[PDB]
Design a protein around this motif. Sequence first.
Motif, PDB file in Angstrom:
ATOM      1  N   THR A 245       0.824  -1.206   0.000  1.00 26.40           N
ATOM      2  CA  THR A 245       0.000   0.000   0.000  1.00 26.40           C
ATOM      3  C   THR A 245       0.856   1.252   0.000  1.00 26.40           C
ATOM      4  OG1 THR A 245      -1.707   1.247   1.149  1.00 26.40           O
ATOM      5  CG2 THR A 245      -0.134   0.072   2.500  1.00 26.40           C
ATOM      6  N   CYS A 246       2.171   1.066  -0.103  1.00 25.41           N
ATOM      7  CA  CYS A 246       3.170   2.131  -0.075  1.00 25.41           C
ATOM      8  C   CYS A 246       3.170   2.888   1.247  1.00 25.41           C
ATOM      9  CB  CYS A 246       2.993   3.105  -1.249  1.00 25.41           C
ATOM     10  SG  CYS A 246       3.226   2.400  -2.911  1.00 25.41           S
ATOM     11  N   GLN A 247       2.524   2.340   2.275  1.00 20.84           N
ATOM     12  CA  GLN A 247       2.454   2.977   3.583  1.00 20.84           C
ATOM     13  C   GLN A 247       3.143   2.103   4.619  1.00 20.84           C
ATOM     14  OE1 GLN A 247       2.042   5.904   2.651  1.00 20.84           O
ATOM     15  NE2 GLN A 247       0.382   6.651   3.980  1.00 20.84           N
ATOM     16  N   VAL A 248       3.888   2.749   5.510  1.00 22.84           N
ATOM     17  CA  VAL A 248       4.508   2.114   6.663  1.00 22.84           C
ATOM     18  C   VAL A 248       3.993   2.845   7.893  1.00 22.84           C
ATOM     19  CG1 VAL A 248       6.656   1.325   7.748  1.00 22.84           C
ATOM     20  CG2 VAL A 248       6.530   1.650   5.271  1.00 22.84           C
ATOM     21  N   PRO A 249       3.339   2.159   8.825  1.00 19.64           N
ATOM     22  CA  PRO A 249       2.818   2.848  10.010  1.00 19.64           C
ATOM     23  C   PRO A 249       3.946   3.515  10.774  1.00 19.64           C
ATOM     24  CG  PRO A 249       2.004   0.573   9.864  1.00 19.64           C
ATOM     25  CD  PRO A 249       3.093   0.706   8.858  1.00 19.64           C
ATOM     26  N   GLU A 250       3.694   4.746  11.221  1.00 25.31           N
ATOM     27  CA  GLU A 250       4.699   5.466  11.998  1.00 25.31           C
ATOM     28  C   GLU A 250       5.172   4.631  13.177  1.00 25.31           C
ATOM     29  OE1 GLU A 250       5.178   9.892  11.224  1.00 25.31           O
ATOM     30  OE2 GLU A 250       6.242   8.043  10.694  1.00 25.31           O
ATOM     31  N   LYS A 251       4.263   3.861  13.765  1.00 18.02           N
ATOM     32  CA  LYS A 251       4.634   2.964  14.848  1.00 18.02           C
ATOM     33  C   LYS A 251       5.845   2.110  14.492  1.00 18.02           C
ATOM     34  CE  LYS A 251       0.334   3.700  16.688  1.00 18.02           C
ATOM     35  NZ  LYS A 251      -0.013   4.707  17.757  1.00 18.02           N
ATOM     36  N   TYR A 252       6.092   1.892  13.198  1.00 17.38           N
ATOM     37  CA  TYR A 252       7.278   1.187  12.720  1.00 17.38           C
ATOM     38  C   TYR A 252       8.243   2.096  11.974  1.00 17.38           C
ATOM     39  CZ  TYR A 252       4.249  -2.890  13.491  1.00 17.38           C
ATOM     40  OH  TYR A 252       3.369  -3.817  14.026  1.00 17.38           O
ATOM     41  N   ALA A 253       7.900   3.372  11.804  1.00 15.20           N
ATOM     42  CA  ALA A 253       8.779   4.296  11.094  1.00 15.20           C
ATOM     43  C   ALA A 253      10.195   4.271  11.653  1.00 15.20           C
ATOM     44  CB  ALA A 253       8.211   5.713  11.161  1.00 15.20           C
ATOM     45  N   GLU A 254      10.332   4.264  12.981  1.00 13.00           N
ATOM     46  CA  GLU A 254      11.658   4.316  13.584  1.00 13.00           C
ATOM     47  C   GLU A 254      12.484   3.106  13.193  1.00 13.00           C
ATOM     48  OE1 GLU A 254      12.079   4.316  18.069  1.00 13.00           O
ATOM     49  OE2 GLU A 254      13.457   5.959  17.521  1.00 13.00           O
ATOM     50  N   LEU A 255      11.859   1.934  13.133  1.00 13.43           N
ATOM     51  CA  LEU A 255      12.616   0.723  12.878  1.00 13.43           C
ATOM     52  C   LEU A 255      12.914   0.558  11.396  1.00 13.43           C
ATOM     53  CD1 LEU A 255      11.113  -1.911  15.371  1.00 13.43           C
ATOM     54  CD2 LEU A 255      13.507  -1.404  15.142  1.00 13.43           C
ATOM     55  N   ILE A 256      12.017   1.045  10.541  1.00 12.20           N
ATOM     56  CA  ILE A 256      12.214   0.946   9.097  1.00 12.20           C
ATOM     57  C   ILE A 256      13.300   1.914   8.624  1.00 12.20           C
ATOM     58  CG2 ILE A 256      11.076   1.520   6.928  1.00 12.20           C
ATOM     59  CD1 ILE A 256      10.292  -1.349   8.072  1.00 12.20           C
ATOM     60  N   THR A 257      13.388   3.089   9.258  1.00 13.10           N
ATOM     61  CA  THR A 257      14.392   4.077   8.864  1.00 13.10           C
ATOM     62  C   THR A 257      15.793   3.581   9.194  1.00 13.10           C
ATOM     63  OG1 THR A 257      12.759   5.806   9.299  1.00 13.10           O
ATOM     64  CG2 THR A 257      15.052   6.549   9.043  1.00 13.10           C
ATOM     65  N   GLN A 258      15.973   3.043  10.406  1.00 14.80           N
ATOM     66  CA  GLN A 258      17.263   2.474  10.781  1.00 14.80           C
ATOM     67  C   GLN A 258      17.705   1.416   9.777  1.00 14.80           C
ATOM     68  OE1 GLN A 258      17.072   1.113  14.891  1.00 14.80           O
ATOM     69  NE2 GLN A 258      15.753   2.842  15.463  1.00 14.80           N
ATOM     70  N   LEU A 259      16.779   0.552   9.360  1.00 12.61           N
ATOM     71  CA  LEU A 259      17.114  -0.493   8.409  1.00 12.61           C
ATOM     72  C   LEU A 259      17.544   0.102   7.081  1.00 12.61           C
ATOM     73  CD1 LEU A 259      14.910  -3.615   7.865  1.00 12.61           C
ATOM     74  CD2 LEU A 259      16.239  -2.650   6.023  1.00 12.61           C
ATOM     75  N   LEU A 260      16.792   1.077   6.585  1.00 11.30           N
ATOM     76  CA  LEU A 260      17.088   1.626   5.270  1.00 11.30           C
ATOM     77  C   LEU A 260      18.342   2.474   5.307  1.00 11.30           C
ATOM     78  CD1 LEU A 260      13.429   2.349   4.503  1.00 11.30           C
ATOM     79  CD2 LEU A 260      14.749   0.613   3.401  1.00 11.30           C
ATOM     80  N   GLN A 261      18.629   3.078   6.457  1.00  8.95           N
ATOM     81  CA  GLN A 261      19.884   3.804   6.611  1.00  8.95           C
ATOM     82  C   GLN A 261      21.073   2.852   6.712  1.00  8.95           C
ATOM     83  OE1 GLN A 261      19.420   6.401   9.949  1.00  8.95           O
ATOM     84  NE2 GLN A 261      18.054   7.833   8.885  1.00  8.95           N
ATOM     85  N   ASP A 262      20.871   1.651   7.263  1.00  9.52           N
ATOM     86  CA  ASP A 262      21.804   0.525   7.104  1.00  9.52           C
ATOM     87  C   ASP A 262      23.211   0.872   7.590  1.00  9.52           C
ATOM     88  OD1 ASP A 262      23.028  -1.838   6.380  1.00  9.52           O
ATOM     89  OD2 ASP A 262      22.992  -1.408   4.209  1.00  9.52           O
ATOM     90  N   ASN A 263      23.308   1.221   8.866  1.00  4.51           N
ATOM     91  CA  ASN A 263      24.576   1.615   9.481  1.00  4.51           C
ATOM     92  C   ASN A 263      25.482   0.414   9.781  1.00  4.51           C
ATOM     93  OD1 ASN A 263      26.648   2.821  11.063  1.00  4.51           O
ATOM     94  ND2 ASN A 263      25.200   4.436  11.694  1.00  4.51           N
ATOM     95  N   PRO A 264      26.604   0.267   9.062  1.00  4.48           N
ATOM     96  CA  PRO A 264      27.470  -0.905   9.258  1.00  4.48           C
ATOM     97  C   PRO A 264      28.069  -1.014  10.630  1.00  4.48           C
ATOM     98  CG  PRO A 264      27.926   0.035   7.168  1.00  4.48           C
ATOM     99  CD  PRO A 264      27.004   1.014   7.868  1.00  4.48           C
ATOM    100  N   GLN A 265      28.165   0.081  11.367  1.00  4.05           N
ATOM    101  CA  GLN A 265      28.681   0.022  12.724  1.00  4.05           C
ATOM    102  C   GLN A 265      27.601  -0.334  13.743  1.00  4.05           C
ATOM    103  OE1 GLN A 265      30.725   3.850  12.852  1.00  4.05           O
ATOM    104  NE2 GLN A 265      32.680   2.822  12.368  1.00  4.05           N
TER     105      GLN A 265
END
Length: 403
Positions: A245-265
């Motif tokens: 649906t191209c939507q990600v609930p904000e309740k998961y926004a924090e966890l999805i952003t970290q994943l997409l930012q993909d910090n190797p450290q």
Amino acid sequence: DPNSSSMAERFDNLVEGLTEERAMAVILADPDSLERPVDKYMAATRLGASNSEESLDVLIQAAELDPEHLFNRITRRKAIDALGRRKSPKALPSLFKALKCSDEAAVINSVEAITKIDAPLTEADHEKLLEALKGEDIQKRAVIQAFCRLGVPGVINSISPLQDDSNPLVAGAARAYMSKVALQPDGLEVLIPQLVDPIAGRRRSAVIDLGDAGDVTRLEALVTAPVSMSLRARSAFQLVDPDKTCQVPEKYAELITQLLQDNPQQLKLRKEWICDIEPTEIENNLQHRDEARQYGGASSLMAMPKAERMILINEIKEKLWSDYVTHYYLTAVVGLQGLEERSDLIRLALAETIPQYTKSRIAAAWGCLRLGLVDQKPLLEELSVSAFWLPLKWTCQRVLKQL
């Protein structure tokens, strides 16, 4: 094209295809009779992009091609995964015949094709698919996955005891089916340490299966599994947005952003995967076949003091910028540390229009936010509306929500 910016050369294979008319004409011919015998393969691929009903009936014939001689099993294989993207249910009789074929490659293709059709299957259909199940483990993982994705509670008696196949690739697929089709997700616990399993293949398989499982509580494990961000993002969006649906609930926004930012450290990396903080060490790890080693390289390239890092970032880039694996990790490191010195790469990467480099557009998107490059807002907007890969299309929406 990163080829004009890099010493390493990415060689594409452009092959001249056929018209639809010519495809239909040759795809069933005896290959010994054709002016150009390779045309016999491409015709299947060409009819896959077709829309007429006749081209679908020709593909059905190519999928029933008599597997006696050499050239008619290759062409049968390509007719079948052609019928997968065609997504018509009239392919289904052909694909189920192929479930019994000798050519085990035809079988795995027929199983994924039937998954793509996503048509209604009769109880009898599920029995035919079940016979394909207990071939060899790779087939078996594929047959199980078709039941999971197609959503088939009928075969639970068969899938359930595979939760304890000694091969984790087979057992993990079956635990995902249980979770998603039978609604019993407690079997997934096994997959959580498997995300950092020493074997690359169980690592990757774990990420896939947690996305097929539809149990969104495992999302937090995906955010840091040392697997390529592409596979995780997909699985994570299967959890947060099952209907695309191209939507990600904000309740998961924090966890999805970290994943997409993909910090190797901040990935769960073992010591074996982390290399020393010297140039050739960083380079070998980025060249390694596996993202776990690659993340270690990128990870410690970040640990390098900025003065030496900028030089190392430059040398690696001009040698391997055309290499899609390296392209990403350079873009991420510039975007993650906010190396305004190298915002040329954030801008090149976000512009990358060749499908191979899509993971870099996410890293470049996140770097536009981090570096405050408001001039990219026109191209972030286009991606927010046009970009094919949903997680790319979702990051540009967040970057604009904040830039």
